[PDB]
């Protein structure tokens, strides 16, 4: 291999000389301890390596060995329950081998080499196989984990092992020409896995939150961004989507964020149950944890590992959801690397290729027909942490141009403890039109009209709030004050959602539809009463308003009876009160 | 109507086949011209 020596050390950057023939973005073992590194710049006989670990104590002259391969991930059975670091090393193994502190240089396989998997063949000798075809199936936690051909491998099946217990290293399939196919294959993290074609995002992604699943839906293959200042509730929203989504597999990437939240996920999720499978929630979730006090260079690796694992699970026909806990941290890591490289920034310190990196990461999502012929989809929800809430910051502005949905958080609602604190005016979604047939078939034949009416009422309330800020709330006419009050009702008991309450945490589409129907029926009845001369303040004292407010705390199973009863109560209250 | 579209696609494929057959005859002369032009 290409072997050199350390020439200069400066933080997470080590320059090694004598590395002629080494390729860009290859993996190098820097130092005597074999720290993981990546070549990011070639200059003559010298190579610029970013160390994925800590460089403290390194001495100039230590050997640097280039492995000749780019950063790669082991894709196979054994990932669905474990937590991984930025370069996909099992944190349980690291804890067992080192203790409560993560020490540099620990070498451990991403996939356990001792676990036995109940292999079950799906092909026969003499069969022609292409990339992405299914070689067999293995049960993992009830998921029929399919063993796949590497995407760029072609040949004819010669010998396949019979059904039984085998490890990942076991060559269950041996093609002609001597090609051996194991239970797992390695893939470069920077290459998007090929697909046959891209499909239209017809089905929606059910996050379980009323506001996100109703006003600003995101489709199954779509992408969303949730930017906001610290304390707004980005990570709580990410955890809520992880808990209550309808996605088969959830990949949570904690790029450069708190370790306490990773511990909270690791502890709570095993206790929580899968809404669809019924087993533990942890059996469907893969965590790539890169805490903020871990080396900066590992953040890009964390993002790429997460998205590559999501793509791999998509190749198995699953519906994957990928929540990145922060992309601004990835941008800051890139900025630190560029500062080491001594390059001229494009804007606010970030290298010019940051926009291209964000675009490439966000374009990996979408619903596709896999090379195996089945259907898979990946949804990416990217959290953005701007400096000071500045939404004009280049990361947020580059994200605004490539996402299909945009959930903006505002500090005003966060301070008021009004959660999910979604800035309705600053948010949008581009999937409303494409999801209409699904909403009609699965919710009600008039759901789009109901949602459009709700959005129109919110828009009218927002327009009238300008005059409210000028003349006060009581200076308006009865109709406009009724619009303001209905908007307040919507904000307080339809958009609000207690992410910690046991019942309010999840809300199916039909419950939100029922609440919207109740609110709009109340609005029509109150408008009729106002038009005939009934006072607005008299309307505001109706206990059926309290019923509408409490509607969100009713359980899903017993909700429809409450919905019918409350509709009857609305009709009776506004017929008796005229 | 559907019949008009089917007739259009049938006639398009038929004239494409006619073009292919009429170019097959001159393929060899075209290849010879290309060979004599390219080679110095």
């Amino acid at each position: 291999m290409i072997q050199g020596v350390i020439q200069k050390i400066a933080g997470p950057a080590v320059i090694a000389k004598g590395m002629l023939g080494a390729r860009m973005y290859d993996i190098c073992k820097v130092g005597e301890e074999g720290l993981v590194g990546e070549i990011i710049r070639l200059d003559g006989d010298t190579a610029f390596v970013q160390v994925y670990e800590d460089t403290s104590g390194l001495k100039v002259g230590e050997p640097v060995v280039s492995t000749g391969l780019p950063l790669a991930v082991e894709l196979g059975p054994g990932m669905l329950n474990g937590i991984y670091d930025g370069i996909q090393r099992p944190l349980e193994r690291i804890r067992e081998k080192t203790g409560i502190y993560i020490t540099r240089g620990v070498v451990v396989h991403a996939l356990d080499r001792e676990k036995k998997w109940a292999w079950t063949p799906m092909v026969k000798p003499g069969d022609e196989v292409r990339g992405g075809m299914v070689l067999g199936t293995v049960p993992e936690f009830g998921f029929t984990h399919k063993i796949l051909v590497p995407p760029d491998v072609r040949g004819r099946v010669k010998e396949v092992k019979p059904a039984g217990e085998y490890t990942v290293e076991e060559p269950v399939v041996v093609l002609e020409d001597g090609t051996e196919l194991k239970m797992y294959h390695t893939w470069p993290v920077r290459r998007a896995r090929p697909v046959q074609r891209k499909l239209d995002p017809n089905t929606p992604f059910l996050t379980g939150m009323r506001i996100l699943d109703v006003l600003f839906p995101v489709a199954m293959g779509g992408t969303a961004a949730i930017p906001g200042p610290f304390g707004a509730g980005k990570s709580v929203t990410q955890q809520s989507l992880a808990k209550w989504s309808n996605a088969d597999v959830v990949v949570y990437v904690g790029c450069g964020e708190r370790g306490n939240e990773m511990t909270d996920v690791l502890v709570e999720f095993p206790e929580l149950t899968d809404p669809k499978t019924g087993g533990p929630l942890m059996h469907r979730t893969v965590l790539i944890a890169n805490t903020s006090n871990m080396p900066v260079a590992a953040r890009e690796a964390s993002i790429y590992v997460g998205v590559t694992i999501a793509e791999y699970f998509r190749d198995q026909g699953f519906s994957v959801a990928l929540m990145a806990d922060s992309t601004s941290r990835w941008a800051e890591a890139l900025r630190e690397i560029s500062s080491r490289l001594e390059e001229m920034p494009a804007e606010e310190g970030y290298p010019p290729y940051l926009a291209a990196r964000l675009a490439a990461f966000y374009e990996r999502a979408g619903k596709v027909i896999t090379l195996g012929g089945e259907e898979g989809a990946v949804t990416i929800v990217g959290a953005v942490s701007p400096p000071g809430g500045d939404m004009s910051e280049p990361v947020t502005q580059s994200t605004l141009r490539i996402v299909g949905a945009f959930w903006r958080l505002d500090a005003s609602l966060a301070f008021r403890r009004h959660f999910p604190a979604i800035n309705w005016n600053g948010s949008y979604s581009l999937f409303t039109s494409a999801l209409d047939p699904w909403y009609r078939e699965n919710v009600a034949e008039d759901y789009p009209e109901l949602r459009d009416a709700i959005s129109e009422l919110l828009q009218r309330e927002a327009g009238l709030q300008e005059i409210v800020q000028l003349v006060g709330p009581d200076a308006l006419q009865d109709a406009e004050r009724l619009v303001i009050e209905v908007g307040r009702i919507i904000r307080e008991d339809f958009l609000q959602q207690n992410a910690y309450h046991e019942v309010d945490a999840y809300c199916s589409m039909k419950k939100a539809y029922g609440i919207m129907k109740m609110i709009l029926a109340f609005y029509k009845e109150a408008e009729a009463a106002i038009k005939r001369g009934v006072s607005i303040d008299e309307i505001l004292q109706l206990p059926v308003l309290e019923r509408i407010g409490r509607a969100r705390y009713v359980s899903e199973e017993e909700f429809p009876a409450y919905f019918e009863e409350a509709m009857k109560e609305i009709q009776g209250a506004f017929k008796a009160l005229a | 109507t559907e019949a008009l579209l089917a007739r259009y696609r049938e006639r398009a494929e038929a004239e494409a086949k006619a073009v292919r057959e009429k170019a097959m005859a001159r393929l060899d002369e075209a290849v010879a011209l290309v060979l004599k032009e390219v080679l110095p």
Binding site: M24, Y25, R41, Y362, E363, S455, E456, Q477 | -
Partner: protein, 470 residues
């Protein structure tokens, strides 16, 4: 084929090649590596010691030992033909529709030469876009650059596709009846996601608009240099068609914000000091070299009309990109978020919109004798309706005068019928009839901007075209 081995430096998009004096500045090179994979590159700086090559794609896998560089052409050239109609390209002239590559009649530089100022002539004839708020109040004249100012969530792409598959000329209105005049639409897509790409493909193929369209679709994950080149390719094809085959070409550029961001990133990559607001200081000149390629030429029957589409970063018109676009282009069409969130499509707001060449493209012998007066009256009446609708919130319905209530009704019906067009294709006569019906709500004689003769000729009709008899 000359091959220039001897790479001595690679960092991000840049690589240095030695002993490569023969490479012309700005030329395109083919970068090859050990695996045989070939990448794209552009020569951005050439000197005696070395040349600087900016790589299109990612530079992973490259190395100083096995990398090879070969020139393909001295100047960026595109092969154009009349057979390009009905095709799709990736923004650098390579077909992506699965059809075989075109046979180029001629190969032209993408950096087209400037039009001679004395060679041009006045834009005189209008283009029917099928949209009432654009055809009637913000008329688009052949040879105008009329950008569409959109927002983050506004449906700019849908309006672009609708205009693309609905735009047409009206030779019968001018009395020529020249259906012999061809029409073509050149569509330039910059930094679009897969969703927008699929939507554009489906919309262009569902109505047969592909038969007169050339598609230059550059994806968001494609190299930024391709994004920079895409408008150049599209405008080169448009200029060739219009000024060598008498075509009436309409060019749509989506989205100029993405183009400006790509220009920003590439300028920063070349170690250039940013100008105002962090954008390159020469952004104005580059946007001019793009936009000012549209127009009409004296002695030639062709025409190029541009409709740039740019999303304001924060719905802010003080941003450098919309500021320079307003500097260079004649007027703008502004999409409105409040209209959009009220369920109105296309969400075009007549009050901030403007067409600077509208007065020369409408009137007797072009559209109709009453077009300009109707448009002015509609503008004034809608402004009155909007302000009265804001006032009625505080003072109530009864306190207003009778004519104020009539203006309220006019504004509501205007937003309901004229602006909220939907997916219709309205000729200018239909839009004018709807406008006259809407103005009939106001009392006769209050229509001050319109002459009495036109009022006598057209006033009196009622609203039945939109509802009751579509």
């Amino acid at each position: 084929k000359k091959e220039y081995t001897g790479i001595t430096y690679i960092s991000g998009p840049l690589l240095f090649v030695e002993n490569a004096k023969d490479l012309a500045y700005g030329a395109i090179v083919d970068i090859k590596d050990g695996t045989g994979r070939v990448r794209g590159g552009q020569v951005i700086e050439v000197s005696e010691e070395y040349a600087v090559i900016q790589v299109f794609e990612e530079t992973t896998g490259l190395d100083l030992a096995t990398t090879s560089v070969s020139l393909v052409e001295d100047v960026a050239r595109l092969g154009v033909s009349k057979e390009m109609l009905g095709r799709r390209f990736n923004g650098i002239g390579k077909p992506i529709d699965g059809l075989p590559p075109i046979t180029p009649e001629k190969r032209l530089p993408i950096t087209g030469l400037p039009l001679n100022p004395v060679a041009r002539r006045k834009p005189e004839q209008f283009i029917q876009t099928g949209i009432s708020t654009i055809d009637v109040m913000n008329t688009l004249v052949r040879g105008q650059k009329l950008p569409i100012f959109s927002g983050s969530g506004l449906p700019a792409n849908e309006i672009a596709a609708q205009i693309a598959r609905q735009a047409t000329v009206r030779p019968d209105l001018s009395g020529e009846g020249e259906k012999e005049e061809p029409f073509a639409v050149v569509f330039a897509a910059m930094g679009i996601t897969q969703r927008e790409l699929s939507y554009f493909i489906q919309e262009f193929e569902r109505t047969g608009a592909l038969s007169r369209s050339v598609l230059f679709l550059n994806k968001a994950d494609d190299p930024t240099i391709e994004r920079i080149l895409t408008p150049r390719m599209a405008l080169t094809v448009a200029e060739y068609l219009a000024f060598e085959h008498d075509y009436h070409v309409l060019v749509i550029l989506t989205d100029m914000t993405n183009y400006c961001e790509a220009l920003r990133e590439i300028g920063a990559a070349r170690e250039e000091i940013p100008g105002r607001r962090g954008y390159p200081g020469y952004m104005y000149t580059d946007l001019a070299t793009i936009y000012e390629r549209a127009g009409v030429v004296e002695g030639k029957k062709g025409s190029v009309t541009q409709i740039p589409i740019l999303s304001m970063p924060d719905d802010d018109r003080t941003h450098p990109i919309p500021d320079l676009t307003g500097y260079i282009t004649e007027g703008q069409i502004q999409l409105s978020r409040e209209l959009h969130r009220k369920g109105i499509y296309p969400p075009i707001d007549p009050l901030p919109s403007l067409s600077r060449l509208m007065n020369n493209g409408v009137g007797k012998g072009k559209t109709r004798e009453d077009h300009k007066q109707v448009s002015d009256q509609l503008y004034s009446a809608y402004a009155n309706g909007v302000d009265i609708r804001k006032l009625v919130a505080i003072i109530g319905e009864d306190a207003l005068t009778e004519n104020d209530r009539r203006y309220l009704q006019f504004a509501d019906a205007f937003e309901r019928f004229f602006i909220n067009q939907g997916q219709q294709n309205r000729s200018i006569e239909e839009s004018l009839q709807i406008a006259w019906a809407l103005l009939s709500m106001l009392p006769q004689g209050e229509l001050k901007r319109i002459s009495k003769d036109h009022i006598g000729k057209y006033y009196g009709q009622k609203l039945e075209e939109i509802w009751g008899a579509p």
